[PDB]
Design a protein around this motif. Sequence first.
Motif, PDB file in Angstrom:
ATOM      1  N   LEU A 183       0.837  -1.219   0.000  1.00  0.00           N
ATOM      2  CA  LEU A 183       0.000   0.000   0.000  1.00  0.00           C
ATOM      3  C   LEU A 183       0.861   1.254   0.000  1.00  0.00           C
ATOM      4  CD1 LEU A 183      -2.576   1.400   0.068  1.00  0.00           C
ATOM      5  CD2 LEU A 183      -2.817   0.870   2.519  1.00  0.00           C
ATOM      6  N   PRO A 184       1.072   1.884  -1.166  1.00  0.00           N
ATOM      7  CA  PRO A 184       1.798   3.160  -1.279  1.00  0.00           C
ATOM      8  C   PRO A 184       0.861   4.333  -0.915  1.00  0.00           C
ATOM      9  CG  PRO A 184       1.001   2.517  -3.426  1.00  0.00           C
ATOM     10  CD  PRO A 184       0.603   1.411  -2.474  1.00  0.00           C
ATOM     11  N   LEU A 185       1.311   5.212  -0.022  1.00  0.00           N
ATOM     12  CA  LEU A 185       0.435   6.289   0.504  1.00  0.00           C
ATOM     13  C   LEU A 185       0.571   7.480  -0.442  1.00  0.00           C
ATOM     14  CD1 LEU A 185       1.014   5.768   4.312  1.00  0.00           C
ATOM     15  CD2 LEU A 185      -0.790   4.875   2.833  1.00  0.00           C
ATOM     16  N   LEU A 186       0.046   7.316  -1.651  1.00  0.00           N
ATOM     17  CA  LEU A 186       0.085   8.339  -2.725  1.00  0.00           C
ATOM     18  C   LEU A 186      -0.595   9.641  -2.291  1.00  0.00           C
ATOM     19  CD1 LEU A 186      -0.643   6.084  -5.810  1.00  0.00           C
ATOM     20  CD2 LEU A 186       1.578   6.848  -4.916  1.00  0.00           C
ATOM     21  N   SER A 187      -1.417   9.615  -1.241  1.00  0.00           N
ATOM     22  CA  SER A 187      -2.165  10.807  -0.771  1.00  0.00           C
ATOM     23  C   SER A 187      -1.155  11.804  -0.191  1.00  0.00           C
ATOM     24  CB  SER A 187      -3.246  10.415   0.229  1.00  0.00           C
ATOM     25  OG  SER A 187      -2.680  10.033   1.482  1.00  0.00           O
ATOM     26  N   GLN A 188       0.017  11.316   0.239  1.00  0.00           N
ATOM     27  CA  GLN A 188       1.012  12.102   0.996  1.00  0.00           C
ATOM     28  C   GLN A 188       2.103  12.602   0.050  1.00  0.00           C
ATOM     29  OE1 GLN A 188       2.490   9.821   4.292  1.00  0.00           O
ATOM     30  NE2 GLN A 188       0.439   9.367   5.081  1.00  0.00           N
ATOM     31  N   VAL A 189       1.975  12.318  -1.238  1.00  0.00           N
ATOM     32  CA  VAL A 189       3.014  12.693  -2.220  1.00  0.00           C
ATOM     33  C   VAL A 189       2.934  14.204  -2.493  1.00  0.00           C
ATOM     34  CG1 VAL A 189       3.766  12.447  -4.574  1.00  0.00           C
ATOM     35  CG2 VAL A 189       3.197  10.406  -3.197  1.00  0.00           C
ATOM     36  N   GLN A 190       4.088  14.862  -2.518  1.00  0.00           N
ATOM     37  CA  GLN A 190       4.203  16.320  -2.752  1.00  0.00           C
ATOM     38  C   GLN A 190       4.416  16.649  -4.214  1.00  0.00           C
ATOM     39  OE1 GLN A 190       7.416  17.176  -0.120  1.00  0.00           O
ATOM     40  NE2 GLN A 190       6.210  16.638   1.675  1.00  0.00           N
ATOM     41  N   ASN A 191       4.040  17.884  -4.560  1.00  0.00           N
ATOM     42  CA  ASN A 191       4.300  18.511  -5.882  1.00  0.00           C
ATOM     43  C   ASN A 191       3.495  17.804  -6.971  1.00  0.00           C
ATOM     44  OD1 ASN A 191       7.759  18.502  -4.901  1.00  0.00           O
ATOM     45  ND2 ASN A 191       6.215  20.095  -4.503  1.00  0.00           N
ATOM     46  N   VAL A 192       2.343  17.228  -6.643  1.00  0.00           N
ATOM     47  CA  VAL A 192       1.544  16.494  -7.662  1.00  0.00           C
ATOM     48  C   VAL A 192       0.084  16.886  -7.480  1.00  0.00           C
ATOM     49  CG1 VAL A 192       3.137  14.543  -7.847  1.00  0.00           C
ATOM     50  CG2 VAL A 192       1.246  14.455  -6.206  1.00  0.00           C
ATOM     51  N   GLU A 193      -0.556  17.159  -8.595  1.00  0.00           N
ATOM     52  CA  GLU A 193      -2.022  17.322  -8.694  1.00  0.00           C
ATOM     53  C   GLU A 193      -2.519  16.055  -9.386  1.00  0.00           C
ATOM     54  OE1 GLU A 193      -4.480  20.443  -8.784  1.00  0.00           O
ATOM     55  OE2 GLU A 193      -4.885  20.496 -10.947  1.00  0.00           O
ATOM     56  N   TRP A 194      -3.233  15.224  -8.661  1.00  0.00           N
ATOM     57  CA  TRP A 194      -3.833  13.995  -9.231  1.00  0.00           C
ATOM     58  C   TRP A 194      -4.930  14.406 -10.236  1.00  0.00           C
ATOM     59  CZ3 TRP A 194      -0.531  10.538  -8.836  1.00  0.00           C
ATOM     60  CH2 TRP A 194       0.263  10.375  -7.692  1.00  0.00           C
ATOM     61  N   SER A 195      -4.793  14.033 -11.519  1.00  0.00           N
ATOM     62  CA  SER A 195      -5.873  14.078 -12.546  1.00  0.00           C
ATOM     63  C   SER A 195      -7.224  13.831 -11.880  1.00  0.00           C
ATOM     64  CB  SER A 195      -5.665  13.060 -13.625  1.00  0.00           C
ATOM     65  OG  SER A 195      -4.442  13.299 -14.287  1.00  0.00           O
ATOM     66  N   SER A 196      -7.334  12.747 -11.110  1.00  0.00           N
ATOM     67  CA  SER A 196      -8.582  12.217 -10.502  1.00  0.00           C
ATOM     68  C   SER A 196      -8.203  11.007  -9.657  1.00  0.00           C
ATOM     69  CB  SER A 196      -9.558  11.810 -11.567  1.00  0.00           C
ATOM     70  OG  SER A 196      -8.911  10.972 -12.518  1.00  0.00           O
ATOM     71  N   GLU A 197      -9.169  10.401  -8.970  1.00  0.00           N
ATOM     72  CA  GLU A 197      -9.015   9.081  -8.294  1.00  0.00           C
ATOM     73  C   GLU A 197      -8.372   8.046  -9.249  1.00  0.00           C
ATOM     74  OE1 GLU A 197     -10.853   7.022  -4.840  1.00  0.00           O
ATOM     75  OE2 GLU A 197      -8.796   7.754  -5.147  1.00  0.00           O
ATOM     76  N   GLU A 198      -8.802   8.003 -10.518  1.00  0.00           N
ATOM     77  CA  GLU A 198      -8.350   7.091 -11.604  1.00  0.00           C
ATOM     78  C   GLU A 198      -6.825   6.940 -11.548  1.00  0.00           C
ATOM     79  OE1 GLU A 198     -10.568   7.242 -15.718  1.00  0.00           O
ATOM     80  OE2 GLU A 198     -11.093   5.734 -14.208  1.00  0.00           O
ATOM     81  N   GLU A 199      -6.120   8.065 -11.528  1.00  0.00           N
ATOM     82  CA  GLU A 199      -4.653   8.120 -11.707  1.00  0.00           C
ATOM     83  C   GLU A 199      -4.009   7.461 -10.494  1.00  0.00           C
ATOM     84  OE1 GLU A 199      -2.750  12.011 -12.133  1.00  0.00           O
ATOM     85  OE2 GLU A 199      -1.958  11.270 -14.037  1.00  0.00           O
ATOM     86  N   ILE A 200      -4.571   7.701  -9.311  1.00  0.00           N
ATOM     87  CA  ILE A 200      -4.071   7.183  -8.003  1.00  0.00           C
ATOM     88  C   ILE A 200      -4.243   5.659  -7.995  1.00  0.00           C
ATOM     89  CG2 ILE A 200      -4.746   6.993  -5.542  1.00  0.00           C
ATOM     90  CD1 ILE A 200      -5.251  10.020  -5.588  1.00  0.00           C
ATOM     91  N   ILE A 201      -5.405   5.206  -8.450  1.00  0.00           N
ATOM     92  CA  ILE A 201      -5.732   3.754  -8.474  1.00  0.00           C
ATOM     93  C   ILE A 201      -4.769   3.069  -9.434  1.00  0.00           C
ATOM     94  CG2 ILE A 201      -7.428   1.995  -9.070  1.00  0.00           C
ATOM     95  CD1 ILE A 201      -9.535   4.311  -8.374  1.00  0.00           C
ATOM     96  N   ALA A 202      -4.597   3.579 -10.650  1.00  0.00           N
ATOM     97  CA  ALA A 202      -3.727   2.974 -11.682  1.00  0.00           C
ATOM     98  C   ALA A 202      -2.264   2.960 -11.223  1.00  0.00           C
ATOM     99  CB  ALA A 202      -3.864   3.703 -12.988  1.00  0.00           C
ATOM    100  N   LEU A 203      -1.794   4.040 -10.600  1.00  0.00           N
ATOM    101  CA  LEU A 203      -0.400   4.086 -10.058  1.00  0.00           C
ATOM    102  C   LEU A 203      -0.259   3.059  -8.940  1.00  0.00           C
ATOM    103  CD1 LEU A 203       1.583   7.135  -8.798  1.00  0.00           C
ATOM    104  CD2 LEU A 203       2.363   5.116 -10.072  1.00  0.00           C
ATOM    105  N   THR A 204      -1.188   3.018  -7.981  1.00  0.00           N
ATOM    106  CA  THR A 204      -1.187   1.968  -6.931  1.00  0.00           C
ATOM    107  C   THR A 204      -1.072   0.582  -7.594  1.00  0.00           C
ATOM    108  OG1 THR A 204      -2.539   3.361  -5.476  1.00  0.00           O
ATOM    109  CG2 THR A 204      -2.402   1.031  -4.930  1.00  0.00           C
ATOM    110  N   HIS A 205      -1.902   0.297  -8.590  1.00  0.00           N
ATOM    111  CA  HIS A 205      -1.867  -1.030  -9.271  1.00  0.00           C
ATOM    112  C   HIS A 205      -0.471  -1.307  -9.824  1.00  0.00           C
ATOM    113  CE1 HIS A 205      -3.445  -4.476 -11.552  1.00  0.00           C
ATOM    114  NE2 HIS A 205      -2.456  -4.122 -12.365  1.00  0.00           N
ATOM    115  N   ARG A 206       0.119  -0.310 -10.469  1.00  0.00           N
ATOM    116  CA  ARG A 206       1.406  -0.502 -11.173  1.00  0.00           C
ATOM    117  C   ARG A 206       2.497  -0.785 -10.127  1.00  0.00           C
ATOM    118  NH1 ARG A 206       5.346   3.333 -14.889  1.00  0.00           N
ATOM    119  NH2 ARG A 206       6.426   1.471 -15.683  1.00  0.00           N
ATOM    120  N   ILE A 207       2.440  -0.119  -8.976  1.00  0.00           N
ATOM    121  CA  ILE A 207       3.403  -0.380  -7.877  1.00  0.00           C
ATOM    122  C   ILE A 207       3.217  -1.821  -7.403  1.00  0.00           C
ATOM    123  CG2 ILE A 207       4.005   0.280  -5.512  1.00  0.00           C
ATOM    124  CD1 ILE A 207       3.215   3.224  -6.489  1.00  0.00           C
TER     125      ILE A 207
END
Lengths: 312, 312
Positions: A183-207
């Motif tokens: 479980l990567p805590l992508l919510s805590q990542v700096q200097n990034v504007e998430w496109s949407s939930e979509e991008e966070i889910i797909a990045l989590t999957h890829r990790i």
Amino acid sequence: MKVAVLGAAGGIGQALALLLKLQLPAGSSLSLYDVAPVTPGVAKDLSHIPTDVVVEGFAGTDPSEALKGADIVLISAGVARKPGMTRADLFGVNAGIIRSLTEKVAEQCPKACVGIITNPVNAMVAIAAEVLKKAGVYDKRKLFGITTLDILRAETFIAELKGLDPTRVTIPVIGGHSGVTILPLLSQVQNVEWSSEEEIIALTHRIQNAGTEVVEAKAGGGSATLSMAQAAARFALALVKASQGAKVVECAYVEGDGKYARFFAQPVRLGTEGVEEYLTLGKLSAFEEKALNAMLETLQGDIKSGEDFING
Amino acid sequence: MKVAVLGAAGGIGQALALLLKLQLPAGSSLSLYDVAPVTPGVAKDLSHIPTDVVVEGFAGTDPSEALKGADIVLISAGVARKPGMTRADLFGVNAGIIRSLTEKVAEQCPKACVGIITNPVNAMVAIAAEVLKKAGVYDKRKLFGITTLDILRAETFIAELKGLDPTRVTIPVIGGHSGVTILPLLSQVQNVEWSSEEEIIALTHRIQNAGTEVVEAKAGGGSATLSMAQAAARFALALVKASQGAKVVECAYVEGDGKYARFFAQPVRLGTEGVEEYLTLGKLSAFEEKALNAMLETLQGDIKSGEDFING
Ligand SMILES: NC(=O)c1ccc[n+]([C@@H]2O[C@H](COP(=O)([O-])OP(=O)(O)OC[C@H]3O[C@@H](n4cnc5c(N)ncnc54)[C@H](O)[C@@H]3O)[C@@H](O)[C@H]2O)c1
Ligand SMILES: NC(=O)c1ccc[n+]([C@@H]2O[C@H](COP(=O)([O-])OP(=O)(O)OC[C@H]3O[C@@H](n4cnc5c(N)ncnc54)[C@H](O)[C@@H]3O)[C@@H](O)[C@H]2O)c1
């Protein structure tokens, strides 16, 4: 500082040995052990590099000579997933290798820090804990499942997606070391504007699935070896830095407070005697809280499978 | 800066690719090519490391895609000496590999620096020079036999024998890259009192024969891979540093003034377009002058064997 690498003749073993020969502090020693007869020659190869790091290599049935006086023991021994092979296939091959090698740690260097690389890490670390307990020497502060590859992957994938410097992306990765337990805590990542939930889910999957990109693209050639060697060296050098009295912070799979599972990957501050403090997960998004409670059964099942091998 | 590694799936290839992925300047690219089908997967493995170095991997019959835009080409392709095998065995296997790959360099990246690792270096570098000449693109400033492993060995063996810091021992090594053609200028070594001539002769021998310590102690497992990858990375990073406009000095096997042989390993100062100046050997002892004139026939014979493969 003496570092022992058990499984040092393999894909990960050899590259890890090279990075430690290059990067361990001047005055260190490095001992390599593997059942493969080539191992003394791997050490001889490395001994030609001009660093003040004494490198010795051992094959044969007994790692006692490699382990004598060791401060840190890194275990990359066992088989890697090839196409067709399941977690269950790895457990059956590697459980007994981890049981055997950790019994020898208990005999020769019971006060060492122990870093498990061998998969499945989630279960292999509980096997080592139960072997150390049966020998009456278990210090839960000194036993780690090396999850650092999940951190390398997270750092790289964030930086490539969001046009950032991958050398300076920080991302806590918690839980376990396989599929849905990562479980990567992508919510805590700096200097990034998430496109949407979509991008966070797909990045989590890829990790979570990155090992398959490699296992796949080598096509039976084996799994990740060079990235894993870098991940193990990074973790090892973190432990060496902590031995010198530095505050060092790393995500690792450790027997902590057991709020979620007996073993759980979390940020820890390292001191001179393994873990000094178990750090907060910080603020979890709704997405992260749900992903955490959703994988807990799998993680607790992985741990049980290791416990039950040693104890029933 | 783009670096291409030809032979990137092998023992040397993979470790070299790892060190370049870790150490090339942020903003660099790294392209790996090997006939081995695993190669795209080696690149995929490395792509998970969080450095700002774009890594791509190619298998198949055509390195043109790996070579497009390359500034530096490193060639570790070909077979390594196993027990039983002679220099002659290596030449027969590797000559055609070097001829094939350097023709593709001439086609796709004729202005690149080219670093030959493949043995026997003494002859393989003359093959590449004759192929580049037949294509009408040969710049003798840009073609190197990588002898840097002889320097690593010399640094290590001096520091271990004389209780010195192996990170700060400097030792020119001149001549060629095999057996009696390797000449380390031990007379110029600082902070050492030689026991006698005996100690200098024995150290020279150990530098010249060090490959056998490894080939032997692996026992068919192969030759030096991890030390050679470090030696190649060191040389490569020297060329990258020179591309940035640094004064960089390295021993390499180059087509220089031809005082002793057409190709001869000597200190060179690198500029932005390969060799900028061919530097002196400095003061030779009597021992060094005699060893130099004694191996010259062998070295000139190694070169002829490469020239005659391409031209008769
Ligand atoms: N934690 C992670 O993120 C991660 C990622 C990649 C792979 N891995 C795991 O690392 C392990 C090693 O992978 P690899 O690709 O280097 O495998 P490999 O087959 O190349 O190397 C394994 C080595 O272990 C040695 N070994 C076997 N039994 C031994 C024993 N009793 N004592 C000492 N050495 C012994 C073998 O001889 C071999 O040299 C595998 O279990 C793989 O699943 C972990
Ligand atoms: N200069 C030195 O000091 C030094 C020292 C050690 C070894 N070497 C030489 O380096 C070479 C590589 O050694 P190694 O131990 O890595 O060998 P290896 O067998 O592990 O690797 C060689 C690689 O070359 C690849 N290859 C073969 N033909 C190719 C082609 N046409 N195009 C691209 N790739 C090709 C193979 O598929 C393999 O991956 C050998 O010639 C060895 O003699 C040089």
